Amino acid sequence: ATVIANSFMHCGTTSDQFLRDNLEWLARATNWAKFTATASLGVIHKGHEKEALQLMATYLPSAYQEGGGLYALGLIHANHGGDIIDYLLNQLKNASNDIVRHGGSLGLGLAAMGTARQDVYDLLKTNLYQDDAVTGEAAGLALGLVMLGSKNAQAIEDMVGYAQETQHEKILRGLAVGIALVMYGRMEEADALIESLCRDKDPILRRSGMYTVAMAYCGSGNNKAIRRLLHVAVSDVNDDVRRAAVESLGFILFRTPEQCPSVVSLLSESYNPHVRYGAAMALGICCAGTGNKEAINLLEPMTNDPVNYVRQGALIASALIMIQQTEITCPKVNQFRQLYSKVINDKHDDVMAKFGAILAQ
Amino acid sequence: MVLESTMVCVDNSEYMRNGDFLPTRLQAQQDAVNIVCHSKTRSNPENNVGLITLANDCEVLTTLTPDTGRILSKLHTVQPKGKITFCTGIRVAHLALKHRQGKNHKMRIIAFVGSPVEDNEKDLVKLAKRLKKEKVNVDIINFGEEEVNTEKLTAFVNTLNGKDGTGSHLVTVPPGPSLADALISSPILAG
Amino acid sequence: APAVDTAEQVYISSLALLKMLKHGRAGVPMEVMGLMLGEFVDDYTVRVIDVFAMPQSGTGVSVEAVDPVFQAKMLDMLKQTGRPEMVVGWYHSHPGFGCWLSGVDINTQQSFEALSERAVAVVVDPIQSVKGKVVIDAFRLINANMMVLGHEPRQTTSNLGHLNKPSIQALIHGLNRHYYSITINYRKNELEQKMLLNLHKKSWMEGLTLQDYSEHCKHNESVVKEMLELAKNYNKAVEEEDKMTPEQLAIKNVGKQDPKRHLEEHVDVLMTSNIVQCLAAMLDTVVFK
Amino acid sequence: TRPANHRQLTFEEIAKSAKITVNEVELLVMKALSVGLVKGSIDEVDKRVHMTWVQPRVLDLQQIKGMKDRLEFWCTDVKSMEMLVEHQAHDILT
Amino acid sequence: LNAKVRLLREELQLLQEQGSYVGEVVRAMDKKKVLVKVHPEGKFVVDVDKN
Amino acid sequence: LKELTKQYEKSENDLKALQSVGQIVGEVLKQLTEEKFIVKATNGPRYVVGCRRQLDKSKLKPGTRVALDMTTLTIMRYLPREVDPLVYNMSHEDPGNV
Amino acid sequence: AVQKVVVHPLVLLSVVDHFNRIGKVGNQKRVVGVLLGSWQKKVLDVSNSFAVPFDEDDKDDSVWFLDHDYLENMYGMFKKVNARERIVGWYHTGPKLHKNDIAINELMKRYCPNSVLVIIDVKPKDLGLPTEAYISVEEVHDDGTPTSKTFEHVTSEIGAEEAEEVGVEHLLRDIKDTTVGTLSQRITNQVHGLKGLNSKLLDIRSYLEKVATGKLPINHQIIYQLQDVFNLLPDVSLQEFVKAFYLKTNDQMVVVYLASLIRSVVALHNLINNKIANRDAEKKEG
Amino acid sequence: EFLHAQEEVKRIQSIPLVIGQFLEAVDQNTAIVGSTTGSNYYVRILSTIDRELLKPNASVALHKHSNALV
Ligand SMILES: [Zn+2]
């Protein structure tokens, strides 16, 4: 969390003094967290461009660490790889077929986000067809991002065809979002994946069907979709799909933050804490940066919620909407800040509540 | 030593009860299987032999097993009270053969044809054709009253493995006083 | 340093749970055990498909109880039928004791782990798991040499506190100190739920049977009498309408009594029983001549 | 041969079929019901023997053809009432 | 209806927790230890909750 | 082989016997309804138990001994009244035949 | 004779597993297995089962193989694990019986004389009761007709012992209907009954058509039993019953009316209490 | 869920059930019943149960495992 908390506090600022300053502690995290830290360096140097290629090699030249750096390199050249893609393509191919491949695909997918490039897509597929679990979770997202908004009939048929043909739930988790972004913004164009997926028994694909409602109907608060999506959040049984139901509202109602603090105001007290969680993330994504103080007051009582993960999302949802707002702008910003301090400095709260606390900071 | 599963098909039809062979046909089969079953295990200790009765039905009295005691013991109370059906006997013996616990043993089948076989010549050859494709060697030995060296039977062995085939013999036993000595001389030590 | 991410799940098939519960209740006074057949599909998932009981023996639930001849032969015979799965773990009941591993159990678990670093061990209390709740926690020994590093060595994940919280009746018998629990998730799929739905499914005949009118009239008469007395209180409870802080009156007289709870609650029962009975009566009059 | 609904049998009709006088149709049914070939009841004020059967007889192609034609009608009504319930209670049916 | 279910669902969870023993406290022993006498069994030097 | 068979068949019953469990002997003391009783173990708590489906509802009247299952605590069969010379009453003193 | 064959939930959940084990690779028809279970007065209890290597051929419909040693050895293990189970019959998921059933049943008669075969239609999920239990009887057919093997039918019912019941109840835990029923589910219980009665009557019609068109043999027995059902109809048009039906329909409406009124006065009282509540808070706000 | 919830609560009063005496009362939804086993237990009170039939000698029934007044 602290490794991810500071990444925000210095995103696109190149001021990694904190990681440079506190160095032994940085090494107190090993295995995967080492992959986040190596990535955290990338976000800190967000938008660094040409210096980055050497920049990444200088600090972090370990399967995880190298995998992290390659993922880190992508963040710097996010949405704008240009030349970095060719190096990333070459580097992903030559890899241990482990974490480095996981970071590699995520980095390449992020770098050529929306490029729809065939060369990148073919390599991403091969890693996905490798079926290495951890590899899949990143190849799937990398597959989706590269095909972002492309409606590629081959990609959607291929991406899903893997879903109901693969074990390794993890690979589905990437593919769930991975095929979600392939339909970004068409807003009517497919409407079949939205209906075909929502009927599949595999709960992971269902969530991907619900997310595909979010990415395919972003902004235009189509009252038809919002009725399609709230339905699953009240009736469906597999709780994970329920969360991706309530949470997915925000993406489609984000253009009109006024309606949304009312729709979920009652969802957010539902008997299964998962649906409650979706309310907070829904409130957060819904209200991107507005200090609505109406979404906030809904999250105010939630932050005391008995469940640990319902609380976790509450602070993150509050922190997400309360970014760059002084006590004068919203009269709860200073109130929550000491709540974030109190939750983090507390010792008997579950780590999960803290993760929201650290991330919230 | 040749790894092979011998699925011996012993007749138990009613005609199997008239002893043109001195004591009786059945003892001839019962004596004969004693040597074929013992012959195979002695040749290779990893072998296994099972027996299928062929009269009135295709019972599988003893599945494919290495231990020769079960085959011998099950022979008793074989009660020759049926009508032979050789059209199906080989199939059930082969189909049971396909369930070989070990997949390496070569295939070798011994049929105890001791009654007149009422099978269309076309049907028998087609059964032989299916055997050729799946590489199973089956030996046919005739007992008791029967159209000597039945044309339907003889065509079966020839198409069984021709064109310089392994030579799955159609060993015809001399009707009248003769033990398995003919059945043991030619087929048992070389099939 | 590999780590069992808390997201790692021990998938229990709909078959295994019934068979594991059945074995446990089979020898409930004593302790039963058997090997579980499954696949280590990957690091983050240990899938168990079938379980086969290892015969109860005087040793109890220990390494010795695992009869190598029984297991080698049974596996050999299940391979022919079309289940070439690998021994993925072992389970043993705990007649009411809970979902924890004792010292002797730990030694077993260490043995199983010797053959594969992911052999999950489960429990299955047939006495506590007596209702909708199924007390079956999965467990994998946390090798004692990892005290320098983090126990439950998980990494990026967030499903650690979900589906459970550390049960107290076990945390005392050694958890996150020598044995950690692995999230248990059941792989029920269609074509299996449908066949289980038949357990209590009624039939076509049911729903057209008209009840019997002799006990129906008695029942209708009985409930109407009981609701009548409940109206008397409703009159007294309302006609009182005492206003000495009525909001406090409505909270100092709450005992699941007259006003509504024993009121229309009966109306729903009385009206549901009649409407269904009547509709059945008229449907039969049409269908049957 | 009765039309089913008119399962009653006027004394005259039974006496005419068997050419047996009315005084003994009373006893004829008395027997036939005694062995177990019927499970009806006898009336005398009207002398119509109410009939209820538990003793079936062997059938015939035409009898079965006739028996099936009636049953096609019965399933037609059972189908019709099913639709008139499912359609009516669609909202509640859940 | 939600508020009613929450009451019922919560009572199901709380109602599975094993009931507690009742024993007479012979005497305090420090600040985090209190000798007690559980009814059927004998003495016990138990701790005390934080509340 | 005949001698082996009769002993082997008895042994097979013993293998089933090892499987069979004990029933906590107890006495019934009230009948709250048609499916509930208040049974007391001979030296044991008073468990509220039901009766097995293949049991006579009636025969189990107050004082009727039963041997309930050790885990279900559901009665599985009646038993005769315990007989012991624990009687303190001469009643058993047979006069003797005179 | 066996009055019932109560199939426990575990067996139909192993058969489903058994069908999946093979059909997934070796696409084939019915999967045959052995059915273990404890006896009762007359109701055979099926408590477990296992698979037996079974291969068949569409040619001659008698080139099959049901392994003997596997059946013998398997049960040798299971009687060790649990001793209350004896081999009691076999199961095959092929919805329609085969010509091979009689011969194979004779085999399983070698292990249990009163062998009952239970057909589990694993593939279908429909009206219900996915088990059909059959026996073997060889009778002279009293009424002067050839003798033959034939499979007589035995009533089948699906039940659960305590242990499996707890597992099953949790195993669904997402589609189980409320036991109370409520008006919504009770009515659906009747649209469901009507659909069945039509469905059963339509199977009857097709068969009657088949015998009517000759394509099937006039049973001469069970054929007139359907004639028995055809006489057991109510004849509601009878006046004395028509009066007696209105009385009970009228006897109930006066209770639904009293039920309706109570729910109305309570409704009004709740609005008056609420109208006071918001109004009083309305004034109290000032 | 409410009907399931009530059914699930109704499941708590399933049989078997140990019998104990209602020694005292501590507060709403809790009790100090003392089991027939020989030990007195601080248990919880099922809401559906009537706090008016808990007379301070009452022979109430306690859940066998969870040991809660049911
Ligand atoms: Zn143990």
Side-chain angles (χ1 to χ4, degrees), chain C residues 31 61 92-94 100-102 105:
Chain C
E31 297 172 10
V61 288
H92 64 302
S93 298
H94 261 230
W100 42 280
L101 291 188
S102 270
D105 292 339

mmCIF file of all heavy atoms in Angstrom, chain C residues 31 61 92-94 100-102 105, ligand 1:
data_model
loop_
_atom_site.group_PDB
_atom_site.id
_atom_site.type_symbol
_atom_site.label_atom_id
_atom_site.label_comp_id
_atom_site.label_asym_id
_atom_site.label_seq_id
_atom_site.Cartn_x
_atom_site.Cartn_y
_atom_site.Cartn_z
ATOM 1 N N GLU C 31 -13.052 -41.591 14.112
ATOM 2 C CA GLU C 31 -12.489 -40.690 13.115
ATOM 3 C C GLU C 31 -12.176 -41.461 11.842
ATOM 4 O O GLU C 31 -11.501 -42.494 11.891
ATOM 5 C CB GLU C 31 -11.228 -40.027 13.656
ATOM 6 C CG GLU C 31 -11.500 -39.168 14.865
ATOM 7 C CD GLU C 31 -10.240 -38.664 15.508
ATOM 8 O OE1 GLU C 31 -9.169 -38.833 14.897
ATOM 9 O OE2 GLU C 31 -10.317 -38.102 16.619
ATOM 10 N N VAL C 61 -6.201 -41.694 12.376
ATOM 11 C CA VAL C 61 -5.893 -40.811 11.254
ATOM 12 C C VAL C 61 -4.409 -40.482 11.376
ATOM 13 O O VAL C 61 -4.005 -39.535 12.043
ATOM 14 C CB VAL C 61 -6.779 -39.572 11.247
ATOM 15 C CG1 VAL C 61 -8.183 -39.960 10.848
ATOM 16 C CG2 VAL C 61 -6.809 -38.912 12.613
ATOM 17 N N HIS C 92 -9.845 -35.994 6.875
ATOM 18 C CA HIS C 92 -10.296 -36.812 7.983
ATOM 19 C C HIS C 92 -11.317 -36.039 8.793
ATOM 20 O O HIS C 92 -11.222 -34.818 8.941
ATOM 21 C CB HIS C 92 -9.144 -37.260 8.879
ATOM 22 C CG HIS C 92 -8.429 -36.143 9.566
ATOM 23 N ND1 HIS C 92 -7.820 -35.113 8.887
ATOM 24 C CD2 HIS C 92 -8.214 -35.908 10.880
ATOM 25 C CE1 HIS C 92 -7.263 -34.288 9.756
ATOM 26 N NE2 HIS C 92 -7.488 -34.748 10.974
ATOM 27 N N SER C 93 -12.307 -36.756 9.289
ATOM 28 C CA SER C 93 -13.372 -36.099 10.065
ATOM 29 C C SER C 93 -12.817 -35.702 11.417
ATOM 30 O O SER C 93 -11.628 -35.948 11.654
ATOM 31 C CB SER C 93 -14.549 -37.002 10.225
ATOM 32 O OG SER C 93 -15.110 -37.317 8.961
ATOM 33 N N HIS C 94 -13.661 -35.135 12.266
ATOM 34 C CA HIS C 94 -13.232 -34.736 13.625
ATOM 35 C C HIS C 94 -14.479 -34.739 14.494
ATOM 36 O O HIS C 94 -14.885 -33.659 14.936
ATOM 37 C CB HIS C 94 -12.522 -33.375 13.591
ATOM 38 C CG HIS C 94 -11.029 -33.420 13.602
ATOM 39 N ND1 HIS C 94 -10.280 -32.675 14.486
ATOM 40 C CD2 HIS C 94 -10.141 -34.085 12.835
ATOM 41 C CE1 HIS C 94 -9.001 -32.894 14.270
ATOM 42 N NE2 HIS C 94 -8.885 -33.776 13.274
ATOM 43 N N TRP C 100 -9.673 -28.131 13.005
ATOM 44 C CA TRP C 100 -8.275 -27.823 13.384
ATOM 45 C C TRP C 100 -7.406 -29.053 13.186
ATOM 46 O O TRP C 100 -7.990 -30.144 13.104
ATOM 47 C CB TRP C 100 -8.247 -27.368 14.838
ATOM 48 C CG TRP C 100 -9.125 -28.161 15.752
ATOM 49 C CD1 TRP C 100 -10.473 -28.036 15.906
ATOM 50 C CD2 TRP C 100 -8.709 -29.181 16.673
ATOM 51 N NE1 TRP C 100 -10.926 -28.920 16.846
ATOM 52 C CE2 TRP C 100 -9.867 -29.636 17.334
ATOM 53 C CE3 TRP C 100 -7.479 -29.764 16.990
ATOM 54 C CZ2 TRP C 100 -9.827 -30.643 18.296
ATOM 55 C CZ3 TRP C 100 -7.442 -30.756 17.943
ATOM 56 C CH2 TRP C 100 -8.600 -31.189 18.585
ATOM 57 N N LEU C 101 -6.076 -28.920 13.123
ATOM 58 C CA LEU C 101 -5.234 -30.148 13.032
ATOM 59 C C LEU C 101 -4.430 -30.357 14.322
ATOM 60 O O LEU C 101 -3.737 -29.415 14.725
ATOM 61 C CB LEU C 101 -4.324 -30.045 11.806
ATOM 62 C CG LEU C 101 -5.016 -30.118 10.450
ATOM 63 C CD1 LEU C 101 -3.988 -30.197 9.334
ATOM 64 C CD2 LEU C 101 -5.955 -31.312 10.390
ATOM 65 N N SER C 102 -4.518 -31.533 14.945
ATOM 66 C CA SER C 102 -3.794 -31.861 16.160
ATOM 67 C C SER C 102 -2.335 -32.130 15.820
ATOM 68 O O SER C 102 -1.927 -32.110 14.659
ATOM 69 C CB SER C 102 -4.414 -33.075 16.849
ATOM 70 O OG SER C 102 -5.420 -32.697 17.768
ATOM 71 N N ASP C 105 -1.984 -35.080 13.457
ATOM 72 C CA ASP C 105 -2.414 -34.719 12.116
ATOM 73 C C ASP C 105 -1.323 -33.942 11.399
ATOM 74 O O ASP C 105 -1.053 -34.179 10.216
ATOM 75 C CB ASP C 105 -3.709 -33.912 12.180
ATOM 76 C CG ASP C 105 -4.881 -34.739 12.657
ATOM 77 O OD1 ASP C 105 -4.805 -35.978 12.562
ATOM 78 O OD2 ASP C 105 -5.883 -34.157 13.112
HETATM 79 ZN ZN ZN I 1 -7.303 -35.220 13.233
#
